XYZ file of C-alpha atoms in Angstrom:
708
model
C 8.216 32.937 12.255
C 5.949 35.149 13.756
C 3.238 33.158 15.949
C 0.131 34.865 16.729
C -2.142 33.793 19.548
C -5.731 35.522 17.996
C -7.873 37.268 20.912
C -11.040 39.367 20.260
C -8.920 42.058 19.913
C -6.441 40.626 17.518
C -9.429 39.322 15.204
C -9.825 41.941 12.943
C -6.129 42.433 12.413
C -6.108 38.550 11.447
C -9.000 38.600 9.084
C -7.148 41.253 7.408
C -3.914 38.849 7.192
C -6.178 36.089 5.874
C -7.763 38.202 3.124
C -4.241 39.510 1.890
C -2.659 36.193 1.917
C -2.276 34.541 -1.357
C -2.648 30.886 -0.241
C -3.484 29.851 3.197
C -3.234 26.396 5.334
C -5.767 24.766 7.672
C -4.957 22.587 10.542
C -6.848 21.363 13.458
C -6.152 20.390 16.987
C -8.445 18.195 18.334
C -9.580 15.668 21.652
C -11.846 12.244 21.997
C -11.367 8.956 23.527
C -10.772 7.642 19.676
C -9.570 11.500 18.293
C -9.856 9.733 14.970
C -13.732 8.681 15.342
C -15.036 12.618 14.861
C -18.567 11.446 14.940
C -18.534 9.756 19.402
C -20.054 12.046 20.906
C -17.051 13.046 23.138
C -14.853 14.715 19.866
C -13.940 18.467 20.504
C -12.045 20.847 18.389
C -9.833 22.657 20.363
C -7.432 25.103 18.197
C -7.228 26.005 14.660
C -4.218 26.906 13.167
C -4.122 28.726 9.936
C -0.994 29.765 8.194
C -0.851 33.044 5.836
C 2.295 32.411 4.957
C 5.847 29.565 5.256
C 6.647 32.091 8.165
C 3.178 33.605 9.964
C 0.401 31.839 11.431
C -2.726 32.724 13.808
C -4.008 29.899 16.284
C -7.914 30.387 17.469
C -8.095 28.688 20.607
C -11.488 27.212 20.788
C -11.556 24.760 24.566
C -8.373 25.828 26.012
C -8.544 24.269 29.816
C -6.960 25.920 33.107
C -4.659 23.005 34.984
C -5.091 24.033 38.513
C -3.822 27.213 37.988
C -5.618 30.202 35.719
C -3.263 30.495 32.488
C -5.272 30.167 29.583
C -6.710 33.264 27.764
C -10.679 33.063 27.274
C -11.742 30.655 24.597
C -12.490 32.623 21.330
C -16.107 31.891 20.725
C -17.293 29.431 17.966
C -18.906 31.855 15.525
C -15.930 33.921 15.984
C -13.472 30.762 14.752
C -16.041 29.924 11.930
C -15.815 33.442 10.594
C -12.651 33.309 10.273
C -12.934 29.956 8.685
C -15.032 30.676 6.323
C -13.023 34.023 5.485
C -10.122 31.868 5.275
C -11.658 29.366 2.867
C -12.258 32.359 0.140
C -8.357 32.196 -0.874
C -6.637 29.455 -2.211
C -6.294 26.695 0.147
C -3.886 23.608 1.377
C -4.099 21.161 4.114
C -1.690 18.288 4.811
C -4.392 15.055 5.516
C -7.449 16.960 4.033
C -10.018 14.516 4.288
C -8.885 14.482 8.249
C -9.145 18.415 8.672
C -12.265 18.759 6.238
C -14.241 16.143 8.258
C -13.449 18.197 11.755
C -14.445 21.341 10.277
C -17.929 20.387 9.348
C -18.512 18.492 12.289
C -16.968 21.246 15.060
C -17.951 24.339 12.908
C -20.860 23.276 10.345
C -18.659 24.082 7.431
C -19.838 21.584 4.664
C -17.595 19.329 2.835
C -18.472 21.828 -0.282
C -17.077 24.822 1.283
C -13.917 22.948 2.651
C -12.458 21.526 -0.453
C -8.600 22.601 -1.229
C -5.238 21.425 -2.415
C -3.505 18.907 -0.021
C 0.042 18.248 0.261
C -0.195 14.509 1.756
C -1.412 13.243 -1.400
C 0.185 15.583 -4.058
C 3.565 14.538 -2.128
C 2.271 10.618 -2.792
C 2.858 11.291 -6.449
C 6.302 12.819 -5.464
C 7.535 10.027 -3.711
C 5.147 6.940 -2.812
C 8.138 5.064 -0.530
C 7.789 8.248 1.706
C 5.404 8.157 4.751
C 2.815 10.050 4.879
C 3.534 12.224 8.559
C 4.055 15.952 7.865
C 6.900 16.161 10.636
C 8.412 13.372 7.975
C 7.603 15.461 4.858
C 9.383 18.479 6.844
C 12.219 16.977 8.085
C 13.152 15.467 4.186
C 12.037 18.783 2.252
C 12.055 21.750 4.808
C 15.339 20.250 6.808
C 13.656 20.782 10.096
C 13.799 17.940 12.071
C 11.843 17.538 15.458
C 13.233 18.463 18.860
C 13.088 15.423 20.813
C 15.863 16.409 23.412
C 14.468 17.000 27.226
C 13.979 20.516 28.249
C 13.857 21.327 31.957
C 11.930 24.371 33.018
C 13.678 27.509 34.826
C 12.739 28.490 38.338
C 8.791 29.587 38.534
C 9.144 29.860 42.419
C 10.633 32.643 45.164
C 9.524 27.791 47.203
C 6.817 29.943 48.344
C 5.319 32.242 45.422
C 4.762 31.662 42.176
C 6.764 34.404 39.693
C 4.236 36.293 38.334
C 6.194 36.135 35.071
C 6.184 32.401 34.989
C 4.483 31.703 31.575
C 6.695 33.761 29.795
C 9.575 32.735 31.627
C 8.486 28.679 30.629
C 7.933 29.595 27.098
C 11.490 31.378 26.799
C 12.126 28.262 28.042
C 10.748 26.456 25.232
C 11.526 28.905 22.708
C 15.255 28.349 23.453
C 15.847 24.876 21.990
C 12.740 25.245 19.309
C 15.298 25.601 16.472
C 14.267 23.438 14.539
C 10.388 23.246 16.163
C 10.007 20.864 19.061
C 8.068 17.409 19.205
C 5.206 16.746 20.919
C 6.319 14.200 23.293
C 9.073 17.494 24.620
C 6.169 19.748 24.686
C 4.442 17.161 26.882
C 7.814 16.442 29.260
C 8.940 20.577 29.743
C 5.114 21.248 30.724
C 4.905 18.356 33.262
C 8.039 19.007 34.597
C 7.270 22.696 35.547
C 3.584 21.783 37.307
C 5.968 18.787 38.673
C 8.419 21.353 39.971
C 5.411 23.569 41.323
C 3.879 20.641 43.685
C 7.491 20.437 44.970
C 6.392 23.884 46.199
C 3.635 24.911 48.082
C 2.282 26.229 44.589
C -0.229 23.519 43.232
C -1.098 20.296 44.784
C -2.217 17.302 42.503
C -2.793 13.925 42.488
C 0.002 12.726 40.893
C 1.337 13.525 37.428
C 0.762 16.514 34.695
C -2.309 14.619 32.320
C -1.327 13.939 28.296
C -4.055 16.482 27.505
C -3.221 19.258 25.141
C -6.311 21.198 26.276
C -4.082 22.097 29.421
C -1.121 22.539 27.682
C -0.749 26.470 27.739
C -1.950 28.640 24.374
C 1.080 30.656 24.662
C 3.244 27.734 24.405
C 0.840 25.330 22.270
C 0.137 27.412 19.776
C 4.036 27.558 18.691
C 3.426 23.367 18.290
C 0.094 23.909 16.035
C 1.373 26.867 14.161
C 4.474 25.305 13.209
C 2.741 22.791 11.871
C 0.477 24.828 9.126
C 3.363 26.897 8.474
C 4.942 23.793 7.211
C 2.247 22.528 5.236
C 2.347 26.020 3.094
C 5.982 25.815 3.121
C 6.032 21.898 1.767
C 3.066 23.127 -0.632
C 5.869 25.410 -2.475
C 7.893 22.618 -3.239
C 4.945 20.584 -4.552
C 3.894 23.705 -7.078
C 8.168 23.580 -8.184
C 7.559 19.821 -8.879
C 4.543 20.105 -10.971
C 6.466 22.324 -12.838
C 8.575 19.523 -13.755
C 5.727 16.758 -14.043
C 2.849 18.016 -15.625
C 1.692 14.570 -16.008
C 1.172 14.381 -12.363
C 0.031 17.395 -11.988
C -2.700 16.709 -14.083
C -3.155 13.186 -12.316
C -3.440 15.009 -9.048
C -6.096 17.636 -10.078
C -8.549 15.412 -12.058
C -8.126 12.450 -10.578
C -6.432 12.169 -6.996
C -7.921 15.186 -4.905
C -11.388 14.787 -6.596
C -11.496 11.235 -5.362
C -10.436 12.008 -2.136
C -12.579 14.171 -1.881
C -15.645 11.298 -3.018
C -14.325 8.952 -0.371
C -14.116 11.967 2.353
C -17.667 12.575 1.978
C -18.776 8.500 1.788
C -16.606 8.756 5.341
C -18.267 11.472 6.465
C -22.242 9.991 5.371
C -21.260 6.662 7.027
C -23.109 3.426 6.359
C -26.042 2.305 8.689
C -25.265 -0.510 11.040
C -27.737 -3.664 11.742
C -26.892 -3.768 15.775
C -29.468 -7.392 15.966
C -27.374 -8.621 12.875
C -24.420 -7.851 14.585
C -25.412 -9.197 18.292
C -26.203 -12.966 15.726
C -22.658 -12.582 13.813
C -21.677 -12.512 17.969
C -23.135 -14.852 19.117
C -22.406 -17.228 16.454
C -18.697 -16.565 16.273
C -18.920 -17.443 20.074
C -20.677 -20.611 19.602
C -18.593 -21.815 17.071
C -15.282 -20.918 19.220
C -16.921 -23.353 22.261
C -17.601 -25.879 19.589
C -14.315 -25.818 18.509
C -13.067 -26.463 21.857
C -15.025 -29.259 22.576
C -13.799 -30.654 19.001
C -10.143 -30.205 20.342
C -11.170 -31.964 23.543
C -12.336 -35.156 21.730
C -9.250 -35.499 20.002
C -7.215 -34.740 22.590
C -8.845 -37.148 24.599
C -8.340 -39.830 21.741
C -4.590 -38.717 20.912
C -3.535 -38.457 24.632
C -6.507 -40.841 25.961
C -7.107 -40.617 30.106
C -4.298 -38.094 30.206
C -6.871 -35.781 28.635
C -9.120 -35.023 31.800
C -5.739 -33.293 33.364
C -6.442 -30.732 30.590
C -9.493 -27.967 30.911
C -8.874 -25.423 28.500
C -5.852 -26.452 26.118
C -6.270 -24.312 23.379
C -6.888 -21.033 25.020
C -3.732 -21.737 27.971
C -0.425 -22.057 25.753
C 0.828 -23.561 29.503
C -1.378 -26.583 28.715
C -0.767 -26.601 24.648
C 3.118 -26.965 24.247
C 2.698 -29.392 27.089
C 0.895 -31.531 25.021
C 2.149 -30.746 21.198
C 5.833 -31.550 22.512
C 6.354 -32.819 25.731
C 3.252 -35.509 25.229
C 2.542 -35.957 21.365
C 6.838 -35.458 20.501
C 6.536 -33.100 17.974
C 9.884 -31.312 16.668
C 10.307 -28.061 18.507
C 10.927 -25.444 15.193
C 10.165 -22.622 17.173
C 10.619 -21.107 20.392
C 9.899 -17.697 22.345
C 12.368 -14.910 23.909
C 12.113 -17.018 27.445
C 12.901 -19.892 25.786
C 9.993 -22.217 25.979
C 8.316 -23.709 22.930
C 6.320 -21.292 20.685
C 2.716 -21.927 20.583
C 2.459 -19.467 18.128
C 0.154 -18.892 15.011
C 3.333 -18.996 12.816
C 4.637 -22.388 14.311
C 1.914 -23.598 13.998
C 1.803 -23.192 10.450
C 4.473 -25.367 10.028
C 3.421 -28.422 12.431
C 0.267 -28.421 9.443
C 3.267 -30.506 7.489
C 5.737 -32.097 9.899
C 4.804 -35.100 12.072
C 4.240 -36.285 15.802
C 6.124 -38.908 17.241
C 3.734 -41.853 16.926
C 3.122 -41.384 13.321
C -0.011 -43.220 13.717
C -1.764 -40.625 15.979
C -0.635 -38.041 12.917
C -4.429 -37.633 11.640
C -5.924 -36.597 14.403
C -2.914 -34.469 15.851
C -2.940 -32.755 12.259
C -7.184 -32.001 12.991
C -5.841 -31.424 16.606
C -3.797 -28.268 15.607
C -6.375 -27.606 12.839
C -9.396 -26.927 15.559
C -6.525 -24.927 17.258
C -6.186 -22.819 13.479
C -9.904 -22.398 13.440
C -10.420 -21.560 17.125
C -7.470 -18.505 16.842
C -9.134 -17.798 13.596
C -12.678 -17.375 14.722
C -11.337 -15.716 17.968
C -9.897 -13.029 15.910
C -12.913 -11.880 14.355
C -14.474 -10.718 17.649
C -11.788 -8.778 18.334
C -11.729 -7.013 15.208
C -15.154 -7.241 14.130
C -17.936 -7.089 16.374
C -16.830 -5.506 19.653
C -13.786 -3.368 17.625
C -16.498 -2.637 15.419
C -19.527 -1.792 17.786
C -17.488 0.076 19.722
C -16.816 2.578 17.206
C -20.701 3.166 15.741
C -21.377 7.096 15.943
C -24.637 8.215 18.359
C -27.470 7.278 15.051
C -25.701 3.885 14.784
C -23.690 4.562 11.124
C -20.484 3.753 11.128
C -17.979 5.602 9.277
C -15.216 3.684 7.675
C -11.977 5.541 6.967
C -10.286 5.567 3.520
C -6.729 6.427 2.682
C -6.744 7.613 -0.820
C -2.957 7.664 -0.876
C -2.926 4.074 1.205
C -0.465 2.027 -1.076
C 2.486 2.545 -3.394
C 0.345 0.466 -6.501
C -2.163 3.989 -6.053
C -5.051 1.371 -4.866
C -7.124 3.140 -1.358
C -6.239 1.764 1.644
C -9.200 1.533 4.014
C -9.426 1.155 7.839
C -12.173 1.104 10.772
C -12.983 -1.072 9.012
C -10.307 -2.680 6.706
C -12.519 -3.655 4.391
C -10.074 -5.680 2.413
C -9.794 -8.505 5.487
C -13.605 -8.578 5.337
C -14.023 -12.264 4.268
C -16.748 -11.815 1.263
C -17.364 -16.117 1.809
C -16.032 -17.274 -1.607
C -16.575 -21.322 -2.073
C -12.738 -21.355 -2.238
C -12.433 -18.413 0.953
C -14.472 -20.796 3.191
C -13.806 -24.563 1.613
C -10.178 -23.647 2.338
C -11.300 -22.391 6.197
C -14.769 -23.643 6.549
C -15.046 -21.869 10.084
C -16.300 -18.348 8.061
C -19.381 -20.309 6.930
C -22.149 -18.846 7.605
C -20.250 -15.769 9.040
C -21.387 -12.852 6.901
C -19.878 -9.841 8.303
C -20.899 -7.533 5.585
C -24.662 -8.516 6.476
C -24.665 -6.553 9.144
C -24.104 -3.067 6.824
C -27.320 -1.722 6.017
C -28.722 0.373 3.738
C -30.990 3.071 4.830
C -35.198 2.960 5.396
C -35.805 4.448 1.550
C -32.130 4.014 0.541
C -30.940 1.094 -1.947
C -27.091 0.083 -2.281
C -26.453 0.119 -6.416
C -23.326 -2.421 -6.284
C -21.375 -2.932 -9.739
C -18.637 -5.345 -10.002
C -16.086 -5.130 -13.068
C -16.133 -8.441 -14.521
C -12.668 -10.225 -14.129
C -10.838 -7.176 -13.681
C -7.282 -8.638 -13.088
C -7.404 -10.556 -16.465
C -8.750 -7.266 -18.077
C -6.434 -5.369 -17.067
C -3.280 -7.676 -17.947
C -4.164 -7.591 -21.365
C -4.038 -3.838 -21.553
C -0.976 -3.032 -19.587
C 0.970 -6.044 -21.352
C -1.300 -5.588 -24.224
C -0.653 -9.097 -25.506
C -3.434 -9.523 -28.089
C -4.147 -13.038 -28.034
C -5.077 -12.313 -24.471
C -6.836 -9.235 -25.287
C -8.854 -11.369 -28.368
C -10.032 -14.170 -26.165
C -10.837 -11.496 -23.067
C -13.689 -9.770 -25.740
C -14.310 -12.870 -27.332
C -15.782 -14.331 -23.901
C -13.385 -17.415 -24.298
C -12.593 -19.092 -21.272
C -8.906 -17.972 -20.391
C -8.101 -20.745 -18.491
C -8.959 -23.673 -21.017
C -7.040 -21.569 -23.824
C -4.235 -22.193 -20.864
C -4.808 -26.011 -20.072
C -5.326 -26.430 -23.755
C -1.481 -25.005 -24.367
C 0.193 -26.468 -21.552
C -0.817 -29.879 -21.514
C -1.777 -30.212 -25.099
C -5.137 -32.163 -24.606
C -8.209 -31.991 -26.196
C -6.996 -28.967 -28.819
C -10.932 -29.470 -30.555
C -13.302 -29.412 -26.697
C -14.637 -26.260 -27.009
C -13.918 -23.743 -23.231
C -17.694 -25.241 -22.526
C -16.696 -29.007 -23.186
C -12.828 -28.655 -21.794
C -14.103 -27.520 -18.182
C -16.232 -30.687 -17.720
C -13.217 -33.453 -19.355
C -9.921 -32.154 -18.090
C -11.410 -30.173 -15.135
C -8.504 -30.110 -12.704
C -5.912 -29.236 -15.287
C -8.511 -26.198 -16.365
C -8.361 -25.381 -12.848
C -4.242 -25.561 -12.490
C -4.152 -23.513 -15.566
C -7.093 -20.920 -13.521
C -3.898 -20.545 -10.816
C -1.368 -19.708 -13.033
C -2.989 -17.056 -15.110
C -3.698 -14.983 -12.023
C -0.324 -15.793 -10.246
C 1.787 -15.811 -13.339
C 1.068 -12.163 -14.130
C 2.995 -10.987 -11.166
C 5.922 -12.379 -11.848
C 6.250 -16.165 -12.616
C 8.965 -18.711 -12.479
C 8.821 -22.778 -11.629
C 10.089 -22.135 -8.099
C 6.909 -20.036 -7.445
C 4.350 -22.571 -8.904
C 5.890 -25.082 -6.347
C 7.332 -23.626 -3.588
C 3.807 -22.154 -2.922
C 0.860 -23.457 -4.752
C 2.398 -27.307 -4.549
C 2.828 -27.790 -7.459
C 4.872 -30.976 -9.387
C 8.780 -30.010 -10.854
C 7.269 -31.143 -14.047
C 3.597 -29.517 -13.910
C 4.957 -26.218 -12.995
C 7.216 -26.636 -16.466
C 4.169 -27.586 -18.481
C 2.328 -24.648 -17.049
C 4.743 -21.764 -17.580
C 6.421 -22.492 -21.015
C 2.333 -22.817 -22.538
C 0.884 -19.449 -20.650
C 4.023 -18.003 -22.625
C 3.967 -19.915 -25.619
C -0.302 -18.569 -25.631
C 0.096 -15.371 -24.676
C 3.889 -14.377 -26.130
C 3.654 -10.909 -25.907
C 3.140 -10.991 -21.555
C 6.690 -12.545 -21.620
C 8.345 -9.564 -23.396
C 6.476 -7.246 -21.806
C 8.021 -8.339 -18.468
C 11.411 -8.187 -19.822
C 10.934 -4.812 -20.430
C 9.467 -3.518 -17.842
C 12.528 -5.473 -15.352
C 14.759 -3.358 -17.520
C 13.985 -0.352 -17.308
C 13.297 -0.635 -13.752
C 17.112 -1.851 -13.150
C 18.342 1.258 -15.457
C 15.707 4.152 -14.624
C 14.740 3.167 -11.489
C 10.985 3.449 -11.940
C 7.934 3.199 -14.421
C 5.083 5.105 -15.604
C 1.569 3.971 -15.369
C 0.494 3.510 -19.028
C -2.648 5.988 -19.014
C -2.882 7.421 -16.007
C 1.029 8.593 -15.730
C 1.522 7.725 -11.981
C 5.736 6.981 -11.010
C 6.195 4.123 -9.557
C 9.292 4.775 -8.219
C 11.606 1.773 -6.329
C 12.237 1.501 -2.437
C 16.227 1.178 -2.797
C 18.431 0.383 0.300
C 20.084 3.062 2.069
C 23.435 2.020 -0.100
C 22.881 2.817 -3.692
C 21.085 6.419 -2.763
C 22.555 9.210 -4.119
C 25.683 6.951 -5.855
C 26.454 6.348 -9.327
C 25.211 3.086 -11.153
C 28.794 2.472 -11.727
C 29.429 1.771 -7.448
C 26.186 0.045 -7.660
C 27.637 -3.299 -8.646
C 29.946 -3.296 -5.848
C 27.795 -2.881 -3.364
C 25.666 -5.570 -5.060
C 27.812 -8.290 -4.921
C 29.338 -7.739 -1.590
C 26.048 -6.941 0.554
C 23.554 -9.747 0.138
C 21.286 -7.863 2.288
C 20.906 -4.784 0.051
C 20.395 -7.103 -2.834
C 17.974 -8.842 -1.495
C 15.873 -5.658 -0.867
C 16.623 -4.222 -4.417
C 15.136 -7.206 -5.816
C 12.172 -7.114 -3.694
C 11.688 -3.368 -4.615
C 12.022 -4.225 -8.554
C 9.170 -7.269 -8.142
C 7.213 -5.006 -6.471
C 7.148 -2.250 -8.846
C 6.301 -4.505 -11.578
C 3.477 -5.937 -9.022
C 2.432 -2.400 -8.728
C 2.235 -1.838 -12.938
C -1.058 -3.791 -12.342
C -2.810 -3.244 -9.532
C -1.750 0.351 -9.773
C -2.830 0.623 -13.360
C -6.481 -1.010 -11.694
C -6.435 1.292 -8.940
C -6.130 4.301 -11.121
C -9.458 3.022 -13.679
C -11.751 2.794 -10.243
C -10.523 5.786 -9.041
C -11.107 7.140 -12.527
C -15.038 5.668 -12.602
C -15.539 6.776 -9.329
C -14.752 10.426 -9.953
C -16.561 10.120 -12.923
C -19.828 8.512 -11.734
C -19.915 10.728 -8.685
C -19.889 14.156 -10.907
C -23.028 12.400 -12.702
C -24.576 11.764 -9.645
C -24.203 15.512 -8.555
C -24.843 16.972 -12.072
C -28.458 15.210 -12.377
C -29.680 16.206 -8.914
C -29.639 12.780 -7.713
C -29.363 11.803 -3.894
C -26.720 8.953 -4.881
C -23.001 8.997 -3.411
C -19.892 6.455 -3.449
C -20.764 5.261 0.138
C -17.400 2.009 -0.088
C -15.158 0.451 -2.829
C -13.515 -2.803 -1.924
C -11.534 -5.072 -4.923
C -13.114 -4.496 -8.643
C -16.546 -3.102 -6.911
C -17.754 0.055 -6.388
C -21.200 0.467 -3.825
C -23.402 4.385 -4.114
C -25.811 4.754 -1.316
C -28.891 5.824 -3.476
C -32.402 7.177 -2.703
C -34.937 4.214 -4.137
C -36.208 5.759 -7.189
C -32.852 7.297 -7.972
C -31.316 4.074 -8.057
C -33.029 3.308 -11.436
C -30.822 6.078 -13.044
C -27.905 5.483 -10.373
C -27.089 2.060 -11.821
C -26.844 3.273 -15.016
C -24.945 5.729 -14.628
C -22.729 3.818 -12.598
C -22.212 1.551 -15.526
C -21.725 4.205 -18.132
C -18.465 5.579 -16.383
C -17.691 1.939 -15.408
C -17.494 0.306 -18.342
C -14.643 1.167 -21.316
C -12.305 0.024 -23.796
C -8.410 0.002 -21.814
C -6.322 -0.540 -24.505
C -8.541 -2.671 -26.755
C -9.063 -5.099 -24.045
C -13.380 -4.062 -22.821
C -13.570 -3.189 -19.658
C -17.389 -4.603 -18.445
C -19.618 -4.000 -15.283
C -22.760 -5.693 -13.989
C -24.744 -3.616 -11.639
C -26.712 -5.425 -8.233
C -29.394 -3.717 -6.013
C -28.336 -4.842 -2.626
C -29.971 -3.731 0.778
C -27.216 -4.996 2.772
C -23.193 -4.927 1.753
C -22.743 -8.954 1.816
C -22.826 -11.387 -0.984
């Protein structure tokens, strides 16, 4: 491997090599307080790695700096590095995490997302093995046979305890290269650099406060460029493997080019744009949460006052302090200790408290107050978690111009759904009537109301009507399920009418009124039974009676029998082939087999399964996970497909619209007020379709906040 550190003199040769390269890889080395929030004023680009072949790369130092001694070469001018990247973009480009690197290039070098589109090994390799980690380090060990070296390297003698050796940097680089056969780890590189400066501090060479700082800017470029350049060469080497795999699977090659890479691009642009944040409304949520956390402590106090009487004065902060808490629950109330900490003290944790909301205390008369007391503690920690996750940890991250840049990981689930972070939009409570009535402390805590559309802009939101049921009927292919969905009939009333055999003449509207709570028991089944259903799952999860569970499950399969036969074939094909192929998209959902069974003849499998109960537990969990992913993953790709198609049409019609967020069965676009009209039209046209004869419909809304 040839590692080049580019200088003003070497730049024309690096440009010549890039121009001649058949395909190039781009990797960025950066620094920030949050190196992920590129939009904070402290964020900086340190260097750019450009690999022209799997064995040749060029490092462009941009913001490297000198620690105590003068060893760094002159950083290249920002315009020189930008011209190198622009020349590299003319050739076919490959990235490992294009969503990050393309946003780095746009923020630090002003190279718009328009120019920076390229291939992404991390996205393509997710189609090769979704159960494999996304890490470039991890994939390099898996396909390229290159483990990272995490040994402890000790430096050569850089002194002669009086004079620094003139060639000390060449001596240090050579000590590093002697152990770099498969490539040194970042931790090991830091340890050697720190050890080298510590030897210098022990001699009279340098005098620094304490330890060497963990700052890539200070790592000598001659050594650091080896690390950075290996990442770019490994990305290119991994792409060679991807092209071979795509030869074997042209259905996945087309799924990658038409849906996966374009959807990644759409969501990279969405993170880049960022949603505007109402800081005033955030303070109201923060102040309302803070008020309610305090409210819940007074509730706990008045409850404790009745629970332990006059001894309740002897406790000032029972909820917060786990000292006063374990004394109350166990020592005083006589609660059965069904969990302890590593140090053997009785555990007052979230998990342990969930258990005591079934269990009972010594005086069974105090039980309704003890229940109320633990419920107050649950609500207290519930409200307390909302603050520590999204009021302050959401306000920290807001860029100078008040926008929040939510990250989306296009390949963030084994099913194929998008992951979301900073903020995880899934874990933002959309205050649904059931969500609230279960956990009522959420009432009024609308976090999405603080996510605002810019002045002159609107949010055009569109939600797939009862998608889970549509997708279920589509993937399974039950005609009864499909026809009811197309006829707009209450699928749940059809289930309850078959499971209980009551009122076989009350229309779907009349049945809802008369046998109300039996229709809602079927509404639970129609949704939970798609992901594999047994009487055990209905009881050990929903609190169903043994009589009720059998009534419902026999009716669900009597009414929609193709669901049963479909489910039989999914579990049968998974047990034999070890994977399933997605109906319309062709995504392969492979099973995450236990380490035993991996590279083992199927005839040798029963020996493993029949003996090892841990491996069989992994096997059967992996089997259910694949079946579940067939439904979530199918709708994930349907939504992904709609996003790229609607976004392509906004671009085509010259509209000021861009898909800003997507969560659950919902797509939100940030559109200019005049364009909102047509944006909503395009949204519904690209969203509504007829999957396997099952009709998908979607109703649009013009919101000014992401709120519900």
